[PDB]
Amino acid sequence: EWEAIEKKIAANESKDQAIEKKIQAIEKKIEAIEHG
Amino acid sequence: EWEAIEKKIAANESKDQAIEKKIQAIEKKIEAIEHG
Amino acid sequence: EWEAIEKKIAANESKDQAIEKKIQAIEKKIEAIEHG
Ligand SMILES: [Tb+3]
Ligand SMILES: [Tb+3]
Ligand SMILES: [Tb+3]
Ligand SMILES: [Zn+2]
Ligand SMILES: [Zn+2]
Ligand SMILES: [Zn+2]
C-alpha cells in the first residue's frame, strides 16, 4: 500500500506540473494579445 | 486511515482533470481571438 | 509515512487551488478581451 499510494501521488505531482506549464504558455499568448 | 487517503487522492484526480478540460476550452477561445 | 503522505496531499491541494484561481481570472479576462 505504501508504494502504491507513493506512485499515485508522484503521478499527480507530475500532472500538476504539466498543467502549470500549459498555464504559462496561455498567459504568454494573452500577454501578446494585450500588447497589440 | 488508508481508505481516507485513497478518497482524498481520487478527489484530487477529479479536480486536476476538470482543470484540464477548462484549459482545453481556453486554448480554443484564444486561438479564435488570435486570428478572427 | 502516514503523516508525510498527508503533508504531500495538503501541498497538492493548495497548489491545485492556486491553479483554480488563475483559471477564474483568465476566464474573466478572455471574455473582457472579447468584449472589446
Ligand atoms: Tb493535483
Ligand atoms: Tb482501499
Ligand atoms: Tb494527520
Ligand atoms: Zn513507500
Ligand atoms: Zn519507494
Ligand atoms: Zn490521518
Residue numbers in the entry:
A (entry chain A), B (entry chain B), C (entry chain C): 1 to 36
Please quote the authors directly.
Herein we report unprecedented location‐dependent, size‐selective binding to designed lanthanide (Ln3+) sites within miniature protein coiled coil scaffolds. [7f] Our design (MB1‐2) features an asparagine (Asn, N), aspartate (Asp, D) hard oxygen donor binding site within the hydrophobic core of a parallel three‐stranded coiled coil (Asn‐Xxx3‐Asp)3, and was found to bind Tb3+, Ce3+, Nd3+, Eu3+, Dy3+, Er3+ and Yb3+, in addition to Gd3+. The structural constraints of binding sites buried within a three‐stranded coiled coil are such that an optimal Ln3+ radius for binding falls between that of Nd3+ and Tb3+. In conclusion, we demonstrate for the first time that designed coiled coils can discriminate between Ln3+ ions based on their size, and that this ability to discriminate is related to the location at which the binding‐site has been introduced.
To elucidate the structural origin of Ln3+ selectivity, a crystal structure of an optimally sized Tb3+ bound to the designed (Asn‐Xxx3‐Asp)3 site in the size‐selective central binding location was obtained. Attempts to crystallise the MB coiled coils repeatedly proved unsuccessful, so an analogous coiled coil scaffold more amenable to crystallisation was adopted, based on CoilSer (CS) and the longer derivative GRAND‐CS, designed by DeGrado and Pecoraro, respectively. The external residues, which are likely critical for the formation of favourable crystal packing interactions, were retained, but the core was replaced with that of MB1‐2. Thus the Leu hydrophobic core of CS was replaced with Ile, and our Asn and Asp binding‐site residues were introduced into positions 12 and 16. The resulting coiled coil, HC02, displays similar Tb3+ binding to that of MB1‐2. To the best of our knowledge this is the first crystal structure of a Ln3+‐binding site engineered within the hydrophobic core of a coiled coil, and provides excellent confirmation of our designed (Asn‐Xxx3‐Asp)3 binding site. The refined structure is consistent with all Tb‐O distances for the binding‐site residues falling between 2.3 and 2.6 Å, in good agreement with previous peptide/protein complexes. Though the electron density cannot assign whether it is the Asn nitrogen or oxygen that is bound, the Tb‐X distances are in better agreement with Tb‐O than the longer Tb‐N distances reported in the literature. With the exception of the terminal residues, involved in the formation of favorable crystal packing interactions facilitated by external Tb3+/Zn2+, all residues, including the binding‐site residues, fall within the preferred region of the Ramachandran plot for α‐helices. Consistent with the experimental evidence of an optimal radius, attempts to obtain suitable crystals with smaller and larger ions, such as Yb3+ and La3+, respectively, have so far been unsuccessful.
